[PDB]
């Protein structure tokens, strides 16, 4: 039950959502159709839930990351945009949104790591890696450093690690190889092993975390800091006069941020899969419809082509959008689970010198293996629990028989 | 030893083991080597534990499925009928004794499911599903159903469900390929979406099971219902005027049930393979043969081409085959465990509503990829416990080193 | 730290180290620059604890089998030898030195299972396996057997079992194929049933073991016996006039040993990698230098060729190399752990009568694929706890970053 005649919308209570119901009172006004914005308290894990029993929401906005689970589940329907409507956004986002070849969500805004520096201390930020070293000897010098950001995620370090040739999984063919990993390649083992020389430098300290990270730019005691959209607020109340630039180059190569892409799917169970369709992609995105949710609460950058180009205007907004183009999607899969444990596992072990960088990276492929068994045995041990309750209940019974 | 010289053959307690000896009375008599069979209490448990130490029949009959896991363990032997003897049964009956390319049984009978109707109540029953929800209301109102079937079990659903293109595992060159499943896709998605809207329609309830179905078409409660040949005997008993046709086709395809086939295999231990490919070839698998062991328990429908054409005068026996060339072959493989449970769960889900249909058929996925790590638990310990004897026991203690 | 400007080098005790050093002191003569031979205890345990924090030797000597193992964890290095050196070396020992498409090891010596026979009892050695049930009748007439070797360990009997066919992984491309196990094939089942075949018509006992085996040719009471160099020293001493010889051939096939390669590896944490490159091709592995190593303790057959010609003129190096040339070289997988243990059972099973040929060589695959379940779950419950004591880690360094981060600068 999800009522037909009318479309239900989840979004996050983070967002614009005030500005999005103005975009349902503006469907309203041209259908005759209500629209009902709620933002309910942890919906990502609600969803799942009740979407599996045939409720739910019509339409959820969500990171895409968290999608790939929902439509492995079977909760979200194939949309159908056709090329035209395609055009309209940013063809590297529509990845974002795919799930067994086929499209599962539409891509709303887009978020990725930046490199933020201090005007006041740096006018001119270094557009490569291995001129910060150098640039941290003349800072020390003022009582300065030049770069502190969060090592102790692998999110973080990943823009580095990934410079040369630094992969999750290859995406080929509208799908990730699972086989096929780049954690301990080449081009990864030469970022790293700069990160790792950075601290033993002393040019970094390897027990950087982000309340470390971010208090100390905001107090001016760091020229640079790397940061999303998420921490400009923060910046902004401390008063100090900062910029959002492209991140710095390695070896010639740009930094590759993971890309994480707000997004709205469908339900599967949803009686108005056409109205739905009407109002994401003639309605909401539309310069008029992200203008609504944005002046509420910020989307930062767009997937709308003509949107993102006014408000590529505020120099951040671009250097978001233009640091994402140049980076990795954050892959929907779930290994994607065993890889992070890996890989913090990895840069925590080469930073602190228990392992070499060619020996923690190596380690990984091991060791994300047995995070997959650890998930692979919890499955199969919950699927055990429901087959004992499924039989429990009907089969043999203190009042039944078979 | 199985000792040379003479044959045994294991054949289960319930099939016509009176008329098979009468077979092996004729094979006597014309070669001069005497014919043993029995009919041991659980030998398709039996089989596997003393043909692998090198005992047991020379020749067992059983169902395919099981023979699988008999292969796999190399317990049976490659047989070798040429050509012409192949000709001689149905082409998609030698599939179902095929394991790793090789052929390792052979195909005497053929079970499949069948549409049943009452023709006191219905004398033209539908050719079609999608008229079965039009059918039930005309006769609701005589206080009758139209249709009722075991829907707890899938392996009576899954005619419906691979109707529109699902499938267990793809069958292509003689192997079944383990990562190519059919139970996702979006023809089982109809055939599903279908059976639930039976259910939430008031056509037919979620919680009816084997007894529950048989009952009701014994009585005259409800027109159809969906079962073997197995049942027959009961509706013998209850005087119910009723005939045995093809299945109903869904999206006009027709349905495709499971196939169960009756197979022969030598055992590999066997130092009279030679003596048992005679017999089965040349003695049981003619019409005479099956002649003998149908007149002491029915075959049901034959894999020999030339006697079925004879048993196929009987409308029933006519249906079951026609079902079954129509159908799929139950396949012999080991993941064929782990896809019951997770479509069992799939389709109890889907009809008694906790799940989407999209959503109960996405779960089997990765209900199948459990069972098989459970499943594989289990080999692992018993392995482990195996090797703890053996070196534990064997290998050193008191009174060793 | 290991020291730049020097060479350490890590090689087992059993070997020559003296010699080694030997040629260390040559290369410090020349070059100027000192090497070091160090022999620990339990070494190629302590390797992998070490390379892997940026400590341990420079080189380090082992059989090629565990090298795939340090080449997994990334603690050895990718040597870079010309076409010219490669001409050098017998062409199949450097298939034992591959790991992941990289060379990762120098061959140094090479060892293989050998037919060994009594020459005052058995002047003509056995070509065939088909001919020995009929030379044990021979001399069982004379209160003797004809061959008795270790039946319990799968490395002496698998020459047999892959005589006809039989693989443990298939090596193509320069590849393991891991889903490729040739183990139940028509070739291992004809070699297992010959085996089988020979117990059941008591011409040779299942009971029989490494020391059973050993100590009766030993004292003159069976013909022949299959062993590898490691046990000439044994036979020298208890005076018994033997010779060594190429393994009997089955179904007009050749016998398949498995082939133990002695191995130098230069570690990844090394800052001498062009220094140990110089040694190893230049002063090593050269006549002279294998010619001192062996002085101290013999090497057996060497990949070198120009050194293995003039070892091959000691008759019992060149079978040792032929029965090695014939056979198929050890796989350096971890899955090679599942396949010992699988095709032990098979072969215990097999001989016992528990369980017939084609039931046994069966059961060889789910006991591997058992094996391989379990050892996942091993390390998957390592990798969990080295996690969770990892939470630790973090909590006490949040209150030590936490001070200094002040300390130096406030
Ligand atoms: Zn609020
Ligand atoms: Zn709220
Ligand atoms: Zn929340
Ligand atoms: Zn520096
Ligand atoms: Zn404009
Ligand atoms: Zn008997
Ligand atoms: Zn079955
Ligand atoms: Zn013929
Ligand atoms: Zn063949
Ligand atoms: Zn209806
Ligand atoms: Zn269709
Ligand atoms: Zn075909
Ligand atoms: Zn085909
Ligand atoms: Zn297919
Ligand atoms: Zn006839
Ligand atoms: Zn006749
Ligand atoms: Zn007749
Ligand atoms: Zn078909
Ligand atoms: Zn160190
Ligand atoms: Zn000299
Ligand atoms: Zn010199
Ligand atoms: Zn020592
Ligand atoms: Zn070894
Ligand atoms: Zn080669
Ligand atoms: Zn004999
Ligand atoms: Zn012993
Ligand atoms: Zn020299
Ligand atoms: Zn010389
Ligand atoms: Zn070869
Ligand atoms: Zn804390
Ligand atoms: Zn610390």
Redesign the interface.
């Known amino acids: 039950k999800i009522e037909e005649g009318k479309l239900v919308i989840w979004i996050n209570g983070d967002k614009g959502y005030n500005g999005l119901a103005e975009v349902g009172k503006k469907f309203e006004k041209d259908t005759g159709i209500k629209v009902t914005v709620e933002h309910p308290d942890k919906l990502e894990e609600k969803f799942p839930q009740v ?4 409720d739910g929401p019509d339409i959820i906005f969500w990171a895409h990351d968290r999608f790939g689970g929902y439509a ?4 979200l329907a194939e949309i159908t945009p056709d090329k035209a409507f395609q055009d309209k956004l940013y063809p590297f986002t529509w990845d974002a949104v795919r799930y067994n070849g086929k499209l599962i969500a539409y891509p709303i805004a887009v978020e990725a790591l930046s490199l933020i520096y201090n005007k006041d201390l740096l006018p001119n930020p270094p557009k490569t890696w291995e001129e910060i070293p150098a640039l941290d000897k003349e800072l020390k010098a003022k ?1 300065k450093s030049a770069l502190m950001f969060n090592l ?1 995620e692998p999110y973080f370090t990943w823009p580095l690690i990934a410079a040369d040739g630094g992969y999750a999984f290859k995406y080929e063919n509208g799908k990730y190889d699972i086989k096929d990993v780049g954690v ?1 390649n080449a081009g990864a083992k030469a970022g790293l092993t700069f990160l790792v020389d950075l601290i033993k430098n002393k040019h970094m ?4 975390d982000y309340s ?1 990270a971010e208090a100390a730019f905001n107090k001016g005691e760091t020229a640079m800091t790397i940061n999303g959209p998420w921490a400009w607020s923060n910046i902004d109340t401390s008063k100090v006069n900062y910029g959002v630039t492209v991140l710095p180059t390695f070896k010639g190569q740009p930094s590759k941020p993971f890309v994480g892409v707000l997004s709205a799917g469908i339900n ?2 949803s009686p108005n899969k056409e109205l739905a369709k009407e109002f994401l992609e003639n309605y909401l995105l539309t310069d008029e419809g992200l203008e609504a949710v944005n002046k509420d609460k910020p989307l930062g950058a767009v997937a709308l082509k003509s949107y993102e180009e006014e408000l590529a205007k505020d120099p951040r907004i671009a250097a978001t959008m233009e640091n994402a183009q140049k980076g990795e999607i954050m892959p929907n899969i779930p290994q994607m689970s065993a890889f992070w ?1 890996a890989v913090r ?1 990895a840069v ?1 072990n080469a930073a602190s ?4 960088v ?2 923690a ?3 990984a492929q ?2 994300a ?3 997959a ?2 998930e ?2 919890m ?6 629990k ?2 004992q309750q ?1 039989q429990q209940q ?1 089969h043999q019974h203190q009042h039944q028989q078979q």
């Open positions: 979407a599996a029993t045939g492995q589940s079977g909760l009582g102790q301990d300290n390897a027990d950087t470390i599967a169970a444990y596992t925590i010198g228990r392992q070499t060619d020996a990276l190596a380690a091991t060791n293996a047995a995070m068994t650890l692979k045995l499955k199969a041990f919950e699927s055990l429901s087959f499924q009907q």
